[PDB]
Amino acid sequence: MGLKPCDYPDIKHGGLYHENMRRPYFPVAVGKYYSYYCDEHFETPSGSYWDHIHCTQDGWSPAVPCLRKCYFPYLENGYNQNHGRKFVQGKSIDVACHPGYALPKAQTTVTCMENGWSPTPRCIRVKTCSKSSIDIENGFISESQYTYALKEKAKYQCKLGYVTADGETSGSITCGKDGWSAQPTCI
Ligand SMILES: O=S(=O)(O)OC[C@H]1O[C@@](COS(=O)(=O)O)(O[C@H]2O[C@H](COS(=O)(=O)O)[C@@H](OS(=O)(=O)O)[C@H](OS(=O)(=O)O)[C@H]2OS(=O)(=O)O)[C@@H](OS(=O)(=O)O)[C@@H]1OS(=O)(=O)O
Ligand SMILES: [Cl-]
Ligand SMILES: [Cl-]
C-alpha cells in the first residue's frame, strides 16, 4: 500500500520556496522533494544558499538542511591568520593568543555552533601572581619567571639542611585568584 507520507518540513533557519503553492499538498508522498533556502548567516550541506529537501522513509533529508556559517573575527590581543574566513557548523579552529592572553576559559580552539562561535573568539588577559610578591627565607625561587598565570606554580628549593613543610627539600606554591596559595617556608 503506502510507505507513507511526510509532513510540512519545519526548516529552522530556512524555508521552502513557492511556499504558497506547496501548502498544503502535505502530507507529501515519499520521493517528493522540494527546493528550499537558508537564511542569511546559514548554508545548505552543499555550501550554497539553496538546495532540495527529500522526503525519505525516515523523515526529511537532509536532517539539518540549514547549517550555520561562522565568520572569523579580528583578534586584537592574539595572532591573526583566519580573519575573514568562513566556516561551516561543526568546525573547530585553533586560536593563538598573545602571551598573557587566553580564550575563555581557557580553551585553545573555537567551534562553530548553530548559535555561533563557542566560545566567542577573543583573547582575554589572564590573571596573574607576581614573583616579586613571593617571600621565602632559607630558600629561593628556582624557576625563575616574573609573571605566573592563574593555576601556574612557582617552584622553590630550600638551602642546604633546610626542609619544607612536607617536609621535603623543595616544594611549590599555587597562583589563584586571591594571590599565592601561601608562603614557602624552609625550616
Ligand atoms: O566579531 S565581531 O563582533 O567584530 O563581528 C565581526 C563581523 O562584523 C561584521 C558583521 O558581522 S555580522 O554582523 O555578524 O554579520 O561587520 C562588522 O565588522 C566589520 C569588520 O570586521 S572586523 O573583524 O571587526 O574588522 C566592519 O567592517 S569595518 O567596519 O571594519 O570595515 C563592519 O562595518 S561595516 O558593516 O562593514 O560598515 C561591522 O558591521 S557591524 O558594525 O558589526 O554592524 C563582519 O564583517 S562583514 O562580514 O564584512 O560585514 C565581521 O565578520 S568577519 O568574519 O569577522 O569579518
Ligand atoms: Cl581578542
Ligand atoms: Cl628567597
UniProtKB/Swiss-Prot annotation:
Q: Subcellular location, in the record's words?
A: Secreted
Question: Which tissues is this protein detected in according to the database?
Answer: Expressed in the retinal pigment epithelium (at protein level). CFH is one of the most abundant complement components in blood where the liver is the major source of CFH protein in vivo. in addition, CFH is secreted by additional cell types including monocytes, fibroblasts, or endothelial cells.
Disulfide bridge partners, by residue number: 6-55, 38-66, 70-112, 97-123, 129-175, 158-186
Protein modification: Sulfated on tyrosine residues.
Domain (Sushi) spans 5-67, 68-125, 127-187
Its biological purpose is as follows:
Glycoprotein that plays an essential role in maintaining a well-balanced immune response by modulating complement activation. Acts as a soluble inhibitor of complement, where its binding to self markers such as glycan structures prevents complement activation and amplification on cell surfaces. Accelerates the decay of the complement alternative pathway (AP) C3 convertase C3bBb, thus preventing local formation of more C3b, the central player of the complement amplification loop. As a cofactor of the serine protease factor I, CFH also regulates proteolytic degradation of already-deposited C3b. (Microbial infection) In the mosquito midgut, binds to the surface of parasite P.falciparum gametocytes and protects the parasite from alternative complement pathway-mediated elimination.
Task: Describe the protein's quaternary organization and the partners it interacts with.
Answer: Homodimer. Also forms homooligomers. Interacts with complement protein C3b; this interaction inhibits complement activation. Interacts with complement protein C3d. Interacts with CR3/ITGAM; this interaction mediates adhesion of neutrophils to pathogens leading to pathogen clearance. Interacts with complement factor I. (Microbial infection) Interacts with West nile virus non-structural protein 1 (NS1); this interaction leads to the degradation of C3.
Q: What is known of its domains?
A: Sushi 1-3 domain represents the minimal unit capable of cofactor activity. The property to discriminate self surfaces from non-self surfaces depends on the C-terminal region made of Sushis 19-20.
Task: Identify the disorder associated with this protein.
Answer: Basal laminar drusen: Drusen are extracellular deposits that accumulate below the retinal pigment epithelium on Bruch membrane. Basal laminar drusen refers to an early adult-onset drusen phenotype that shows a pattern of uniform small, slightly raised yellow subretinal nodules randomly scattered in the macula. In later stages, these drusen often become more numerous, with clustered groups of drusen scattered throughout the retina. In time these small basal laminar drusen may expand and ultimately lead to a serous pigment epithelial detachment of the macula that may result in vision loss. Complement factor H deficiency: A disorder that can manifest as several different phenotypes, including asymptomatic, recurrent bacterial infections, and renal failure. Laboratory features usually include decreased serum levels of factor H, complement component C3, and a decrease in other terminal complement components, indicating activation of the alternative complement pathway. It is associated with a number of renal diseases with variable clinical presentation and progression, including membranoproliferative glomerulonephritis and atypical hemolytic uremic syndrome.
Protein name per its UniProtKB record: Complement factor H
Q: Which gene encodes it?
A: CFH
